[PDB]
Write a protein that binds this ligand. Structure first.
Ligand code: COA
Ligand code: COA
Ligand code: COA
Ligand code: CA
Ligand code: CA
Ligand code: CA
Ligand code: CA
Ligand code: CL
Ligand code: CL
Ligand code: CL
Lengths: 118, 118, 118
């Protein structure tokens, strides 16, 4: 069955502001594997990539049932992708299984949803 | 398996307008348990809370397969939350089981999604 | 279980622009059955209908795992609806089973989500 679901719509301007005020904001949100992908992008694409991963992790934290905080850090969640470019999540604290995720972008937002199966 | 899924993105300004034109709009959308939580909020938070519950119930009505109308009222759906703050839905007309739901907020919208299992 | 999930938020203005620049844009995105429904709408409703179907098909392509391209065309996906107005998807290339979908509209967007079961 389904353990939990999560949805999030993140504001591009907020992510850009936090990145502009905190020199290491991206390192706070992304894992090393995620950063390897992030570092190759333009200033604009970096913001969209980061906002989408931020939305995916907040959505995951809702499906997990705790939100981001004492029980779950942004660093405990990793978005990976298969050979076709389809994203999926790995949260070792949960299990080794792939968790369902989908991301979408607009002019002002980066949105994502997650479904964790039993 | 999955009985149905539902998604909704509600406009904060529309909800605020309806609440401003109808003195009992919140009572139309929310159950007594939901209102107990609503009454404790500021004018601004009330609007966001109400818009999110409205989105969650419209999303539920889509997963249910009928929409809001003759077969389903906003009063037949209740959003509850566990000790961690995770929301879930109860629709007695359907079954006593918890229905999956997730909510997210932006500057102009309150959005939600629902998944009803078999 | 779940084979895949997909989410998409499409910009109404972009869809209107493509339809204004390409005389056969609707025919590119919609199947014959979908067009039969589209042709009956006003200019404004046509745009909203088309944007919602576009979002639903992009969401489906993400759940399918390939995106829209060489392995999947907009024409391979069809949104149908039951007697209550609830939409569902049929992708013959996948299987004859109904695929879960939900659509929602705002002032500037048409959004959709999809869940494909095993
Ligand atoms: C849940 C979380 C991930 C997102 O909260 P947010 O950004 O404030 O708000 P969102 O609008 O995206 O989500 C709001 C909703 O989460 C849902 N929620 C709250 N706790 C939850 C939990 N434990 N499980 C699932 N959903 C939960 C609620 O329904 C709530 O909306 P509501 O108050 O109208 O019912 C929160 O734990 C959080 O922000 N974590 C801290 C991270 C942080 O401070 N980051 C700074 C940048 S590095
Ligand atoms: C489905 C419902 C919940 C939401 O409709 P809405 O606000 O007009 O529109 P939304 O943009 O959020 O959703 C539109 C979509 O619902 C989906 N829909 C319609 N009937 C449906 C049903 N029975 N089951 C599942 N989905 C359905 C459709 O795909 C439709 O978009 P489309 O016409 O492009 O295919 C509708 O039944 C409703 O508005 N109920 C009446 C409530 C009301 O009048 N409230 C006033 C405030 S108190
Ligand atoms: C995936 C697709 C459907 C949508 O992509 P898009 O419009 O460019 O962008 P969206 O913002 O909606 O989706 C972006 C996300 O798709 C997800 N994605 C990419 N490939 C994917 C795949 N194979 N399976 C599932 N998800 C995938 C990604 O996470 C990506 O965001 P990210 O780069 O931050 O990780 C793409 O295949 C596409 O646009 N198809 C071509 C259709 C076209 O050119 N149409 C013109 C109009 S007729
Ligand atoms: Ca958020
Ligand atoms: Ca709605
Ligand atoms: Ca906007
Ligand atoms: Ca898209
Ligand atoms: Cl945000
Ligand atoms: Cl609305
Ligand atoms: Cl778009």
């Amino acid at each position: 069955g389904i353990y939990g679901i999560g949805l999030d719509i993140t504001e591009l301007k907020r992510i850009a502001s936090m990145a502009g005020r905190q020199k290491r904001f991206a390192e706070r949100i992304l894992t090393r594997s995620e950063l390897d992908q992030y570092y190759e992008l333009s200033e604009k694409r970096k913001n969209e990539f980061l906002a989408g991963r931020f939305a995916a992790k907040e959505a995951f934290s809702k499906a997990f049932g705790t939100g981001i905080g004492r029980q779950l850090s942004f660093q405990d969640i990793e978005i990976r992708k298969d050979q076709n470019g389809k994203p999926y999540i790995i949260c070792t604290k949960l299990s080794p299984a792939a968790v369902h995720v989908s991301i979408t972008h607009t002019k002002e937002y980066a949105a994502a949803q997650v479904v964790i199966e039993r």
